Coordinates of C-alpha atoms in Angstrom, one line a residue:
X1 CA 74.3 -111.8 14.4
X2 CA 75.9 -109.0 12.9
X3 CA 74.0 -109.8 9.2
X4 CA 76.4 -111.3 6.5
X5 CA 80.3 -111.8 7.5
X6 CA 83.3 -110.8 5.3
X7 CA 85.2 -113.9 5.7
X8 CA 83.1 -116.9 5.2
X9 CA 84.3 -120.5 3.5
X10 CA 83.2 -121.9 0.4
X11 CA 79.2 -122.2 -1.2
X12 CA 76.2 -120.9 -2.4
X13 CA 76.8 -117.6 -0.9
X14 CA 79.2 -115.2 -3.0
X15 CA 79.0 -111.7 -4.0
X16 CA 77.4 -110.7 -6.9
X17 CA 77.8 -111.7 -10.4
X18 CA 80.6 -109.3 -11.1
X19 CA 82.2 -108.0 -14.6
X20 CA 85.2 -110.3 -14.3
X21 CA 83.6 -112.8 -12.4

């Protein structure tokens, strides 16, 4: 629940591609 989470381990699931990143 509550969609996504802020803190999460390591995977697949990152935030987008970013500048720096």
């Amino acid at each position: 629940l509550g969609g996504g989470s802020v803190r999460f381990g390591p995977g697949v699931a990152f935030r987008a591609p970013s500048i720096h990143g």
